Subunit: 110 residues, 4 copies
């Protein structure tokens, strides 16, 4: 009874079990909202978003831990987290310190 759904992000296809996405409701991917992005004549959801950051988002559902890839711009990252309804307070202790510095450095810009 487990579906293997396809998440077409910007052309990049990601697959995960419907189960994995349901572990976290209230977020866009684990709550009916995602039905808003679905082409029935392809049988897949399409997201006109960044495919690179989505990997961290998806890895979150499957591990519970949200990491911060230090090659990514803190703004791009936050932008996507916002869209997916994931709160950056969920950032694992393993990545928090780095997220904290990058966020602070960003805040002191002009």
């Amino acid at each position: 009874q487990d579906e293997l759904i396809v998440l077409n992000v910007s052309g990049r296809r990601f697959q995960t079990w419907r189960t994995t996405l349901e572990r976290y409701p209230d977020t866009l991917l684990g709550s009916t909202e995602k039905e808003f992005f679905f082409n029935e004549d392809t049988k897949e959801y399409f997201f006109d978003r960044d495919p690179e950051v989505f990997r961290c988002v998806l890895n979150f559902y499957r591990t519970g831990k949200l990491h911060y890839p230090r090659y990514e711009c803190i703004s791009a990252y936050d932008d996507e987290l916002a869209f997916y309804g994931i709160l950056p307070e969920i950032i694992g202790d393993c990545c928090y310190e780095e997220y904290k510095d990058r966020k602070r450095e960003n805040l002191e810009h002009h």
Copy 2:
């Protein structure tokens, strides 16, 4: 509105026709891309770097142009130039980083 396929060196990107249209005058938001459009495969083809194209494509989605820290500033500029996008529009979130790498480059 509909999905268009942007094949960049074999890596296929998809977006909404209207996403690109948010910025005319630039290669992609123009009819200029139409010269890269293949009629048989029905997808646009670009013999360019697919990673910087990712950043260019994202600029159209968010209005923010980011500079991938891991990329060579030189390769980044060449690519930007091709898409008719000025480095000047790089976001404030990445400008500091961009200008530093460009400085270390000229030396």
Copy 3:
């Protein structure tokens, strides 16, 4: 010999059956992978991170296990553990880097 498809979260990797066989005892070089093998799509499926899998797969091709600098040391270890590969086998080219990031992590 023949090509096998390793679908990792939708990202499909291909390699030679003999490439994986270079390391028995580990999940992939074993028959253990066979439990992830789907019979209808005829490809192995892994609900894991496709980027670290890239590094794991490369270890089979070159005998060298590299540590992607941009990856979280924690996410890297969890993944390594799943594939039955010991961080101890990380190459000398990446060990220095690996151990430093692991040190900064525990603190």
Copy 4:
């Protein structure tokens, strides 16, 4: 008369004009050697190599400049360059300094 060939690297498909690859003969990709990796019942060359580094290799043929992605291990990088028959002396002046430091740092290891 220009072919669009497919380079299946580790499952990642790359496409470039036969023309682009010919700009640099003597290298594995621009010299008959590559015929050694070809499945006629797929009409594409397959390389059981790293897909990430191949992007720099391919960008080389199309621009003449060989860059060094600073997120990559210098050994992995050299390993691939060797396989593709590309000499690291071709590294653009834009990336040489960084390649030089990473190579030196590697040389002082144990």
